[PDB]
């Protein structure tokens, strides 16, 4: 599913992550959008031969299981490919595990370099939420 701006920003704020460890929405979709451009179904392979899933691009080194990522770990108890369904709640589920380990939001690359510092809340200007 590609979700609009806005519907992302709705779903995200229903599933908890408004606020979630500090985190306001604008993070969040943010985020989504520089790492999978809002497309639940978004694959991207990394240099260490672990791939990203999903609307967060939820990597398989360390998060999920997808059977071909040597010496990782499945920290959310999904495979990889749950992360791509419609319904963004095991996407939800395992960020919010993600962002409380230690470094928050720091653990998406597109993150630290594309929302950080930046006016966040202009992702979710315009949105009824
Ligand atoms: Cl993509
Ligand atoms: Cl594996
Ligand atoms: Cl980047
Ligand atoms: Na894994």
Partial sequence: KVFGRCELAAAM????????????????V????????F?????????????DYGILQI???????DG???????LCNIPCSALLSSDITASVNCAKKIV??????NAWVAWR???????VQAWIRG???
């Fill in 13 to 28: 704020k229903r599933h908890g992550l408004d606020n979630y460890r500090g985190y306001s929405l604008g993070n969040w």
């Fill in 30 to 37: 943010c985020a989504a959008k520089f790492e999978s451009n």
């Fill in 39 to 51: 497309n639940t179904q978004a694959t991207n392979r990394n240099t260490d031969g672990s791939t």
């Fill in 59 to 65: 990597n398989s080194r360390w998060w999920c299981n």
């Fill in 68 to 74: 071909r990522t040597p010496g990782s770990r499945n």
């Fill in 100 to 105: 409380s380990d230690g470094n928050g939001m």
């Fill in 113 to 119: 370099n594309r929302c950080k510092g930046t006016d």
């Fill in 127 to 129: 949105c009824r939420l």
